[PDB]
Amino acid sequence: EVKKKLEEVWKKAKEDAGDNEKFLELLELILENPEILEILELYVFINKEDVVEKLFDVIKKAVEDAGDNEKFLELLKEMLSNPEIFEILLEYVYIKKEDVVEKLFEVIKQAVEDAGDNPVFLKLLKKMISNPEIFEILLEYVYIGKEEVVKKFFEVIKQAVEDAGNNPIFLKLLEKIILDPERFKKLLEKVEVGEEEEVKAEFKEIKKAVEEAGNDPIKLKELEEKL
Amino acid sequence: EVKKKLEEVWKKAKEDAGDNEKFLELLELILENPEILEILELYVFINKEDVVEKLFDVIKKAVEDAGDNEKFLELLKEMLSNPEIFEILLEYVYIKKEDVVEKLFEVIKQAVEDAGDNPVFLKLLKKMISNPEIFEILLEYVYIGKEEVVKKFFEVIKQAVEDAGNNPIFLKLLEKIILDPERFKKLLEKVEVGEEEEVKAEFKEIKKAVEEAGNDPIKLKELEEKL
Amino acid sequence: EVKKKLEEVWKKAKEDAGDNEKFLELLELILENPEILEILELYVFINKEDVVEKLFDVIKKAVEDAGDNEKFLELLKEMLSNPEIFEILLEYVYIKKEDVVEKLFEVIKQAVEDAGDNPVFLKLLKKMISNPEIFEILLEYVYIGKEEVVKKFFEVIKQAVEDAGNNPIFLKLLEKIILDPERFKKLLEKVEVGEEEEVKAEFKEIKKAVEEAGNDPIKLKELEEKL
């Protein structure tokens, strides 16, 4: 029965959307992934199916909204390929929060449109929206309504990447600071209270420390220890 | 020399078992996996070979006992593909505990026969028998002789999956509770003392809490924090 | 622009080194790996390129020095395939420490030449030089000048593998002791002070404990707990 339920859901949304080539090529990535296909098969035996049918429509209305934004489509492929990110979306549809997901799906599109050929910020964007704890935190900040603070933190990160002097040492350190979910929420907390410039005041502090030690790999190891 | 020793072990057990197609198709999965083939090559230079020869016979007598139980053969492929599970088996043969492995190999077959088209319990079964710490705990409970408590815990989990109301939130929470090896042994400890119904009394407590909060993703985050 | 910068760097070093087949077949492994190719693309947008150009010359002068040492070329493939090891090398070139990398690249070649058909020590060598924390510690010990203590620890490990009696239990325990970066530096600290024989005195202590418990999987679990 589970094989018939899924292939019906496949042929249904496939036939209903033929003009959307970006959703057709993305739906097959979902089927070819045995880990996330295993989630769909467990969700039809659990008598959801509509939860899977609603998640397809959210991403179908997502690839249609962005349209020919290729730097956002590859994000969705990285997100929908992650079995935990794909499953926390299915759990944000059984809870009936398809709107909270759609909002977050668009604030990252705005960060991509604002990126403007900044592949270092794109890698940081992929790296945090693929972390289950960070991705849940971003959804939990949008359901409350504090959606612009996510845009505000995304901008402070985008500007901190530019305020690096092309120094790969500080960019790697900036990665290890924001990816840690404990420090990620602390920086979101300071942006939500108004310290959007004081959080940046510490990024310059760390960048100055990187340039102070500089070409000494031992002097830099202590800086990574000082966190 | 190591290449000749292995291909001799290959052609030996291959020729001695031709009527067993399930062991022939499974032996090639072992050879095609470079990680676990690297374990076999280190075990012939270490002058075991018989340890590898005895492990093949255990799984050969395992695919023969289950026979055409396809829901158990895919388990063995998931277990024998894991390089740490495959290696902790080779270490339970040098210790001369090929019997303790055979018992555990059959209690999971009984959980599969008792499953009866319950793919959610099959995913939980794969998820815990692939954890090295959990797999060692299951072997260590059988060597003592307490083998039915493993069957007893497997049944309480199988029934807790059914006692979910098709709620994907509680099934994901039930997964994160039993996969943690520290909580896994605590639930095995309470089943070994007789509290087979009191452990279930807490599963209803958590399921009631899931339905209490329900469609609120913030109210559910605290429930996952209350562990 | 980033696509043109890289293919220029590719065709440059490719044309300048045609007699070195080992560097040509290794350079294509770097390009075929999307994770580490993503690092190179972020390093040309960051206006390095020379950092990538210098890293290629370090490994080109590495495959040329070792020559037809196949047991060292497969090491470099395992190291250069790791996206974090490959990136911590790019950060040891922007710091202008291409010499500290070249030294460590040769002390592992000496451990391979001294290995002499000891595949258990080769697996331990791959396992620790692929750990980012351990690999950074090995670089940080060479930049100071304490390079022979790395050779000294590599020899004590190579001899501890032989002093195992072909016991797979103690070899797995010896693996879990040295791979832990906290214990890895403690053993390097005791070798740097002169206790090259006292660290070995504890390896016999653990091996004697393995043979004492022996064929009891419960008595051995406590030994792994006693760390």
Author numbering:
A (entry chain B), B (entry chain B), C (entry chain B): 3 to 229
Quote the study on this structure.
We determined the high-resolution structures of five designs from C2 to C6 symmetry by X-ray crystallography, cryogenic electron microscopy (cryoEM) or both. For C3HR3_4r, the overall C-alpha r.m.s.d. between the crystal structure and design model is 1.21 Å. In contrast to C2HR1_4r, C3HR3_4r has a large twist, causing the interface to become staggered, with the top two repeats packing on the bottom two repeats of the adjacent monomer. Notably, C3HR3 was verified to high resolution for the bounded four-repeat, bounded eight-repeat and unbounded fibre designs.
